[PDB]
Structures are given as structure tokens and as C-alpha cells.
Structure 1
Amino acid sequence: AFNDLLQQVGGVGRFQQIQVTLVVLPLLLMASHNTLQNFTAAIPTHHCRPPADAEVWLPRDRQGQPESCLRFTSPTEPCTDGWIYDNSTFPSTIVTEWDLVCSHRALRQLAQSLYMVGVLLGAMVFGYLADRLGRRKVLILNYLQTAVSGTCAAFAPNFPIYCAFRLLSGMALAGISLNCMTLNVEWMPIHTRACVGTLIGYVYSLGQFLLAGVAYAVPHWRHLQLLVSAPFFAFFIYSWFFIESARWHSSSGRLDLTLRALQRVARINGKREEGAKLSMEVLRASLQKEASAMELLRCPTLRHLFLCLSMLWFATSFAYYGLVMDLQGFGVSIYLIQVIFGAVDLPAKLVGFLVINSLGRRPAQMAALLLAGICILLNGVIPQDQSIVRTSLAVLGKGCLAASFNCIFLYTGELYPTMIRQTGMGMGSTMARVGSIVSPLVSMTAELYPSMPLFIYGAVPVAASAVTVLLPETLGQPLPDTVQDLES
């Protein structure tokens, strides 16, 4: 009867209208801190530095472009001396700093892979410790860490220090993402649980505009990192004024704290007359009513569903986080491609929302996934001579994958049974990050062929699109109460 208590104190009042906004505001930096290795680690055109013994010193080939490997040993030797990087559009990047060109090309992918590896451990550890210390405490620690370990990376004199600090920043950021929604959805009524779920998505989708503006505003990478990591201190200074969730207090066993929090929120809302009526006995009379992860194993009915759901999550995450990177090579500047990519998610979600309930849950998923897969696989045959279809197909694929993410979230939310839903959603989201981890890993094979990663990126969604035909349709049906009655 917690919902009735919320409607008694006022339900959706000023307390919510302040706290939800002030808790969702810092999510505008997710897009900036996630896809930063497009502006902070761009590769400009470079060539071998001739010896200081002096135009014709390099074996230029492929339409006269200077060659970056050899240096005409005699007026066929490795450089081992240095490179002359261009400074017309990219004054300084990571490759310009430690010379990760033509011999250590895979280290950019390695850094991205480590940054993504530092997301799984966060989502695990700080999700475990969120239900044992308190949402607000963990949020405060996350706010402190994202600024402490994020601003000192801009002064790293070596590569491993930068990698480790980025890993820790991702560790904090993974926890902030989960805890934000976990604390936000608790204070809202049951009838407004889906409205806030879509709110976070559009907040995330707006951060690409800020990234595009800021990157142009400051070209330097150290200053860019400092600026994108600084505001977390301001967000942290105020973060002591939040109110702990009442549901967690009630479930823990301490009802006095729940009572006090209810009175306090009543004072903020201005309904103290009902708070005074609220007492200990009525709470014990109204809330008197108030699953292992291995149960998925040794029970085929849930294992069969979980396997397919995890496969879909993995395929979607792999395709999405392989697509969004490597903006270079499209002919158009990365700055413009950023805003173009950020301008296609809104219509993707808008169209997908209608089609989940109009066409069907599974029809929409299969159509979107197949279209994205074929569109991406098509990109690997047309030559780079073109400059229009290359961008059109990429943006269409990105939007389609965003719509696929919007559809699968609701599909898994409404598919699983009631009691095991909380752990099933977490397990499904867990497999949505291994694909992101492995995305930079398979891009390292670009040395073998110049489009093999692109072919790999299109085969997985195409294969997964035919896998959705093995799940029941559940449109316009009651939520399955339990496993016993779960038959159709």
C-alpha cells in the first residue's frame, strides 16, 4: 500500500519535480564521456620525418601520398626517429603525444576496450553495494570518484596511467548510470513508471549535441578532458541534500526512518496535516504485506528464453557500439557527423514506439534488426569514391539500432515473469556490455583487410534477426504471473 501512502502525502509534488530533475541533469555528460575517442584520439595525416641532413625523400605512392613506413635509407628503413603531424585542424591528440602510428595502431582500440572493460565491473560491484549501503551514499561516492579520477587523467605523462584512470572513470560512470534510474523510479507512482523510463533516453540522446559543441569550442585534448570532467565537482558539492528512498528504508526493517522521511517530504510538499495523521501503527497496518540467479539454470522454461534474450542484447550492443566509432573516412568532418548521428535517434524512438504496439513486439524487433544488419552490410561493397550514400546508410543504421534498443528494453521488461524480472533485466543488461567490450577488439583486424570489420559488423545482426522467430508473441496479453501458468 505504498502507492496509497504516496497519494496521501501528495504523490507527484514539488519534491519530485526538483529531485528528479536535479538527479537526471548530470546525465547530459554520458554521451560526452562515452564517445570521446573520436575527438580526443583522432588520427591526422602524417609522414616520416626526414633526417636533419638536407621534397624527394619519401617513397610516395597511391596518387603521390607520402608513405608512412619507409624513408629511402639511401638517397627502405624504419623511421625510429619521429613523425611530422599536421596541425591545420587537429592541433594535438593522443597519437601526436606518444606516437601511436604505424607500429602501435591497436593501442587506441586497446584503450577503448579497457575503458569499456571498466564498465562491467562498475555495474556489478556498485550495483551489489547499492542495495547494502544506500542509494544516496553510493551516488555521492560516484560523484566524487568521477571527478577525482577523471580530472587527473588530463595530466597523465604516460599511457598506462591514462588507461587506468579512464578505466576508473568508466567504473564510476557505470555505477552512476544504474543508480540514477534506480533511485529515480522509486519515488514515482506505479502509473507513471514508463514515462520516466523514456525520459532518460532522450536526456542521453541530447548529450551528443553538447559534445559536438564543446569539441569544436576547445580543440586541445587535455583541456577537453578537463572541461568534460570538471562539472562533476559542482554536481558533488550539492549532492548531500538528497533524501534517501523510503522503499529501501521500509524493506530494510527500520520503520522510524521511513516515518521521518515521510513527514519531511510532507513538509516540503506542504501537506503536514496528513503527515501528522501518519503514525507507526497505521504504517504497520497498511504495509503489513511487506529467486536465486541459479534458478535460470536447471529449469528449461527460463533458460530457453534467457538464451535468446541475451543473444539479442549482445548482438544489438555489438552492432551499436561498433557503428558509432570510427567516424573518420566518411569525407565529411567528424564534427558534422556527430550532430547528424545525434539527430537521428529522436525519430528512431518516435517511430519505434508506435510500431512496437501497432505491428507487434517481435515483428518490430525482427524488422528493425534485419534492416540495420542489411544496411550495415551494404556499406562494405560501394567504393569510397561516393560521399552521400556512405553517410546515409550509416545514419539510417544508427537510428535503426537506437530503435532496436528502445524495442528490446520494453520487450524484455514485459516478457519475463513477475518475481524474477528484477534479476532478469540485470542479467540481460550485463550481456549488453560484453559486446561493447569486444567491438574495439575485432576492429584491430583492419590491418588484414580494409573492410573485414565492416563485414563482421553486418553479419551478426543479420544472423540475429532470424532468431526472434523462436519466441512467443505477448502483445495485448496479461503479464505472466509465474512459471506454472506461463504456457502462452
Structure 2
Amino acid sequence: AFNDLLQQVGGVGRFQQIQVTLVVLPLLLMASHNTLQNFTAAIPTHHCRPPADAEVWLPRDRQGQPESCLRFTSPTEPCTDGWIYDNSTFPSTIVTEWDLVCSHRALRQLAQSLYMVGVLLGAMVFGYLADRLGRRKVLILNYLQTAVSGTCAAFAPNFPIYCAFRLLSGMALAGISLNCMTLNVEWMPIHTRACVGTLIGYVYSLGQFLLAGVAYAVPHWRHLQLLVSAPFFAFFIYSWFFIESARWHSSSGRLDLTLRALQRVARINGKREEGAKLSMEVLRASLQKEASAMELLRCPTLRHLFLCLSMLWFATSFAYYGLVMDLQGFGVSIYLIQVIFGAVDLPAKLVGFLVINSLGRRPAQMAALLLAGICILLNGVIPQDQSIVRTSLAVLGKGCLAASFNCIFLYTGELYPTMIRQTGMGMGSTMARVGSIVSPLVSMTAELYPSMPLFIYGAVPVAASAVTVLLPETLGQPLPDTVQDLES
């Protein structure tokens, strides 16, 4: 009956209207910190450096554009003398610093994959150490780490240092992302748990506008990294005034701390009379009523349901974080493609919340996944000459993939039983990060063919859009209680 207590103290009061916004404000920067290897690691046009023994020194081909690997040995040799990058649009990036061109093309992908290898470990470690130390105690440490290892990478003199510090930044953000929602949904009432679940996805897709603005205001990569990883100091200085969630104190056993927190919340809300009316016996008599991750195995009815959902999660995340990168090659500047990839997410949700309720979950999911797969696969056929009909397919695929996220999140929840639903969505979201790890590794093979990555990104969602023909429909039904009554 804890919700009745929360309603007694005031329900949704000024305390919530302050702490909720102060905790959800630091998610305007996660979009910037995720898709940064588009403005901080761009690749400008480059050609070999002629020896200062003096124009006609480069074996140009393919419509006259100079080669990028040979230098006419005598007036067909590897460069070994540094390159001469252009400085008209990208004055400085990572690839300009450490010469990641024509022999070390895999290093950008290695950095982007090492940033995402340190989001899995983050979501694991800072999720295990959150319900054992405190939500606020972990928020403070993460707000600190994501700025003591995110501005010390903007001053790195080597490549491995940059890689390791980006890994640590990802490790911190992967704990901020969990603890935000976990702490935020515990001080709200029970009837407003879905109005705060669609606010961490409505302010999440506003970081892309901020990125398209900032990265255009500040082109250099060191200044950009520093200016994007600086405000976490301000977000950390005031991170001591947060109030710990009373439900965690209640679960841990210590009830006097819960009573103190509730009295403080009552004083803040302006209900001192009912706050002092609260006592120890009242709480002891009102809250006296108060799942293995391996049980998914050795149980066919659960394993058969887990495999399909894992495949759907993986395919969606893989296609998404394979498409949202490589904004170069559409004939239009990146500062205009970002503000179009981030402004097509409103219709992709207004239609997702209009097709699932009218037909179901299976048809909407399958349609979104297959249409995104086709729109992705069709770009690896049309030649790069077209530039008006080659970005529309990209924006359509991105919208369809966002709709796929928003539908699979609800479907996985409504599908599982009620006791294992907490550790089912966890194992389902974990498989949405192995996808983001293996997504940039595939883009390395673009050396073997100029379109094989685009073909790989197009076939996995299509091969996954045929898995939903094995899952039960769950529109207009009661949520299944146990594994026994889960039949149809």
C-alpha cells in the first residue's frame, strides 16, 4: 500500500516537479555523446604529399580525381611521407591528427566499437552496484566519472589513451541511463508510470538538434569534445541535494530512514499535519506485506519465447546503429542531414501509437521491420549519382526503425509473465547492445566491396521480420500470470 502513502504525502508535488526535471535534464547530452563520431571523426578529401623537389605527380583516375595511395615513384609507391588534407569544411578531426587513412581505415571503427564495448559493462556493473549502495550514491559517481574521463580525452596525445577514455565515458553513461529512470519512477504514483516513460524518449531525441547546432558552432574536435563533456561538472555539483528513494530503504529493511524521508517530503510539499501524523507503527502496519536468470533455460516455454525476442532486439539495434552513422555520401552537408534524421522521429511515433492499437503488435512490428529492411537494402543498388531520392529512403528507414523500437518495448513487456518480467526486459535490452557492438565491426569490410556493408544492414532486418510469425498475439488480453496459464 506504498502508493497510498505516496498519495497521502501529496502525490505529485513541488518535490517531484523539481527532482524529476533535475534528473531528466542531463539526458540532453546522451544523443551527443553517442553519435559524436560523425563530427569529431569525419574524413576529408586527401592526397599524397609530393616531395619538395620542384602538380602532375599523382596517378589520378576515375574522372581525374587524384589517387590516395601512390605517388609516381619516378617523374606506384606507398606514400611514407604524410598526406595533405583539405581544410575547407573540416579544419581538424581525429583522422587528421593520427593519419588514419588508406592503411589504418579500421581504426575509426575500432574506436566506435570500443566506446560501445564499454556500455555493456557499464549497464552491468553500475546496475549491480545501484541496488546495493543507493540510486543517488551511484548517480553522483557517474556524473563525476563521465566528466573526469570525458574532458581528459580531449587532451590525449595518443590513440590508445583516447580509446580508453572514451571507453570510460561510455561506462559512466551506461549507468546514468539506468539510474535516471530507476530513481525517477519510484517517487511517482502508480497511475503515472507511463507518462514518465514517454518523457525519457521525448527528451532523448532532442539531443540531436543540440548536436547539429553545437558541432556546427564549434568545428574543431578537441573543443567539441570538451564543450560536450564539460557540463557534467555542473550536473555533479548539485547532485548532492537529491533525496534517496524511500522504497529502496523499505526493501533493504531500515524503516526509520523511510520515515525520515517521508517526513521531509511532506515538509517540502506543505502537508506537515499528515507528516507528523505518520508514525513508526503506521508504516509497520501499512507496508507489512514486504526469478532466477537461469530459469529462462531448462524450460522450453520460456526459452522458445526468449530466443525470438532476443533476435528482434538484436536486429533492430544492429540496423539502427548501422544506419545512423556514415552521414557522408548523400550529397548534402551533415549539418542538414542530422537535423532531418532527428526531426523525423515525431511522425514515426504518432503512427506507431496509431497502428499498433488498430491492428495489433505482430502486424505493426513485422511491417515496420520489413519496410525498414527494404528501404535500407535499396540504397546499395541505386548509384551515388542520385541525391534527392537517396536520402528519402534513409529517413524512411530511420523512422521505421524508431517505430520498431517503440513497438518492441511494449510487446516484450506485455508478452512475458508477471514474475519474470523484470529480468526478462533486462536480458532483452542487453541483446540490443551486442548489436551496437557488432554494427561498426561489419562496416570494416567496405574495403572488399563498396556496398557489402549496406547489403548486410539490409538483409538482417528482413530475415528478422519473419520471426514474428511464431509469437502469440497479445492485443486486448489479460497479462499472463504464471508459466502455467501462459497458453495463448
The equivalent residue for 1:263 is 263
Q: Is the 8 A contact 1:27 1:204 kept in 2?
A: yes
Q: What percent identity do the matched residue pairs reach? A: 100
Give the Cα separation in 1 of the matches to 2:163 and 2:177: 21
CA shift for structure 1 position 290: 0.9
Runs of 4+ aligned structure 1 residues displaced above 6 Å come to: none
The equivalent residue for 2:428 is 428
Give the Cα separation in 2 of the matches to 1:197 and 1:185: 8
Deviation track 1:426-459 (CA, whole Å, cap 9, x = no partner) reads 1100000000000010000000000000000010
Give the Cα separation in 2 of the matches to 1:100 and 1:110: 11
Deviation track 1:283-314 (CA, whole Å, cap 9, x = no partner) reads 11111111110111111111111111100000
Deviation track 1:335-378 (CA, whole Å, cap 9, x = no partner) reads 10000100011111111012121110111101100110111111
The equivalent residue for 2:225 is 225
Deviation track 1:211-264 (CA, whole Å, cap 9, x = no partner) reads 000001000000000000000000000000000001100000000000000000
CA shift for structure 1 position 415: 1.1
Question: Tell me, which stretches of 5 or more residues in structure 1 are unaligned?
Answer: none
Q: Is the 8 A contact 1:49 1:82 kept in 2?
A: yes
Give the Cα separation in 2 of the matches to 1:309 and 1:63: 48
CA shift for structure 1 position 30: 0.6
3-state SS of the aligned residue for 1:190?
A: coil
Question: Tell me, which stretches of 5 or more residues in structure 2 are unaligned?
Answer: none
3-state SS of the aligned residue for 2:72?
A: coil
3-state SS of the aligned residue for 2:47?
A: strand
Give the Cα separation in 2 of the matches to 1:229 and 1:344: 27
Give the Cα separation in 1 of the matches to 2:213 and 2:20: 26
Q: Is the 8 A contact 1:126 1:138 kept in 2?
A: yes
3-state SS of the aligned residue for 1:357?
A: coil
- The more displaced of 347-356 and 118-127 is 347-356
Give the Cα separation in 1 of the matches to 2:139 and 2:36: 23
Deviation track 1:316-335 (CA, whole Å, cap 9, x = no partner) reads 00000000000001100011
Q: Is the 8 A contact 1:373 1:461 kept in 2?
A: yes
CA shift for structure 1 position 198: 0.9
The equivalent residue for 2:178 is 178
CA shift for structure 1 position 315: 0.3
Give the Cα separation in 2 of the matches to 1:177 and 1:114: 18
Deviation track 1:380-420 (CA, whole Å, cap 9, x = no partner) reads 11111100111000000001100100111111111111111
3-state SS of the aligned residue for 2:57?
A: coil
CA shift for structure 1 position 26: 0.5
Give the Cα separation in 2 of the matches to 1:242 and 1:436: 33
**TM-score, structure 1 normalization:** 0.99
Deviation track 1:257-281 (CA, whole Å, cap 9, x = no partner) reads 0000000000010011111111111
Q: Is the 8 A contact 1:15 1:269 kept in 2?
A: yes
Give the Cα separation in 2 of the matches to 1:178 and 1:332: 36
The answer on 1:484 being equivalent to 2:484 is: yes
Give the Cα separation in 2 of the matches to 1:346 and 1:202: 9
Q: Is the 8 A contact 1:57 1:72 kept in 2?
A: yes
CA shift for structure 1 position 202: 1.1
CA shift for structure 1 position 187: 1.0
CA RMSD, aligned part only? 0.6
Q: Is the 8 A contact 1:259 1:280 kept in 2?
A: yes
3-state SS of the aligned residue for 1:215?
A: helix
Give the Cα separation in 2 of the matches to 1:171 and 1:268: 35
The answer on 1:301 being equivalent to 2:277 is: no
Give the Cα separation in 1 of the matches to 2:250 and 2:107: 49
1:154-233 alignment, distance < 5 Å: 154-233=154-233
3-state SS of the aligned residue for 2:203?
A: helix
Deviation track 1:91-120 (CA, whole Å, cap 9, x = no partner) reads 000110000000000100000000000100
Give the Cα separation in 1 of the matches to 2:480 and 2:193: 19
Give the Cα separation in 1 of the matches to 2:53 and 2:132: 68
Q: Is the 8 A contact 1:442 1:453 kept in 2?
A: yes
The equivalent residue for 2:30 is 30
3-state SS of the aligned residue for 1:47?
A: strand
The equivalent residue for 1:352 is 352
Q: Is the 8 A contact 1:205 1:346 kept in 2?
A: no
Give the Cα separation in 1 of the matches to 2:370 and 2:40: 33
CA shift for structure 1 position 190: 1.3
Deviation track 1:15-70 (CA, whole Å, cap 9, x = no partner) reads 11100000000100011000000000000000000001111010011111010110
The equivalent residue for 1:278 is 278
Give the Cα separation in 2 of the matches to 1:189 and 1:425: 22
Q: Is the 8 A contact 1:314 1:431 kept in 2?
A: yes
Give the Cα separation in 2 of the matches to 1:367 and 1:194: 25
Give the Cα separation in 2 of the matches to 1:173 and 1:5: 33
* Larger helix percent: 1
3-state SS of the aligned residue for 1:151?
A: coil
CA shift for structure 1 position 152: 0.4
The answer on 1:94 being equivalent to 2:94 is: yes
May I ask how many residue pairs the two structures share in their alignment? 488
Q: Is the 8 A contact 1:41 1:95 kept in 2?
A: yes
Deviation track 1:144-163 (CA, whole Å, cap 9, x = no partner) reads 00000000000000000000
Give the Cα separation in 2 of the matches to 1:100 and 1:212: 25
**TM-score, structure 2 normalization:** 0.99
